[PDB]
Structure formats: structure tokens, C-alpha cells
Amino acid sequence: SIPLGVIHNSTLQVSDVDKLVCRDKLSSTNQLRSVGLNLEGNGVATDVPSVTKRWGFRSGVPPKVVNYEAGEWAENCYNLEIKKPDGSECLPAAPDGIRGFPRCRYVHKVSGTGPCAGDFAFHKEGAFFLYDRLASTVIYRGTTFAEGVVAFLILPQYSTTIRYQATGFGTNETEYLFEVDNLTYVQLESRFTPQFLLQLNETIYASGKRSNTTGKLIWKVNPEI
């Protein structure tokens, strides 16, 4: 069945209920917690061009939702609004009882389009999508989440928004853009820290290199910098 852990003299053991560990007494339901842990801990890459290869679309499978009771503080939280090319939404809207993931350093708000061949968005490595005290296995539209998994236990006795754009989302040929405003932006490259981008919008709002027209604006970056 579903495995389970136990704390004993500050040492984590598999809670063997198959061979009962009678020495560890379970006295109250307060002694049970259900904790969620982020994939930032394991060391997976966190930038968006490394992220959206782990995601993918599928139809014909129902979604599921399980709750937990505490989670890690996170360093990266994501958000999506992806439209099908005929103008409809790829992602289903969030049913009620869903709030965003509540403690986040940065929010990688990502919009744009893609082919969207399927109904839902699943995680290719079978991880969860951590919402507010509710791990799910799909992505709801417009609700800020984080990635990670859930461990079970037996116990002893603010943010900052970064906006992107994307074209051809999901495939291996998806292009990525920054956003300064709704007309001015700059193409992304892999060697870019987000602090570089923070200096970039501050530089652009200082030097005024924005849209003074009605069209869209795509900078690139100095290839030797």
C-alpha cells in the first residue's frame, strides 16, 4: 500500500505496518501530518525553457486532487494562460476551493499560444502541481502553483511578478519572450538570470526605450556581454 514514515529519536524510518513496530505509539490524530516538498529541493532545473519540457498534454484521463497540511517555502512559482490557435483556452478554469500557492519568491507568469493537442496538462515525471494545501495533477488556468511531491508522516511527542510570452507552447520549438509592457519586450536567451532582466526593465524605464508607437517591439541582447 501507500508507504509511510515515522520519527524516532530524530531518525526517519519507513513506518512498517507490514511488520508492526510496536515500540512507537500513536496516541492522537494530531500526530499525523501530511507534508508537501518541492522539486526545488532535488535540484531540477527551474528556468522556463527547462521547465516546459516536463509538461505535456493528454486527453481521456480524469484529474485528481489530494490535500496536505504543510509545505516548503518556494523559490519559483509558475502560472499559465495558454490559448488554442482558434481562440479558445487550453487549460480548464479552476473549480472552487482552489487558491494559489501562497508563499512564493517569484512568479513566472506565462501567457501565449500553442497547439494544445489534448484536454489537460499532465506532469511527465508524475509529480504533483502544488496549489493552496491541495496537490493536483493538472494545471488550472490562471492559478499560481509550484512543483513538487507529497510525503506522509507520523509525528513524535511579498512576491515579484515576471511576465513572459510563448509561441508554439508544449513542443520542442517553443520561442520565449520577456515582457516590459504590452508592446515593448525582448527575446530571451538561456544565459539570462532574472536579475539581469530586473536591471533590464529598470534600464529601459530609465532610458525610455519603450513603445512610442502602436506596434509590438522585440529587442535582442548584445551577443558579447
Binding site: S1, I2, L4, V14, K64, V149, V150, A151
Partner: peptide, 23 residues
């Protein structure tokens, strides 16, 4: 603890496939 989480993931997925509850 994190290794425990990664060990729990498979059985939890196979449990959640087996139910019909949303939450």
C-alpha cells in the same frame, strides 16, 4: 524525508487512479 516523498509518489498515484473522488 525527500527520498521518502519520492518513494511515496508511485503508490499515491496508483491510489488516486483507483478512486472516483475529486478531492
Amino acid at each position: 524525508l525527500r527520498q521518502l516523498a519520492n518513494e511515496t509518489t508511485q503508490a499515491l498515484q496508483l491510489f488516486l487512479r483507483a478512486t472516483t473522488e475529486l478531492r
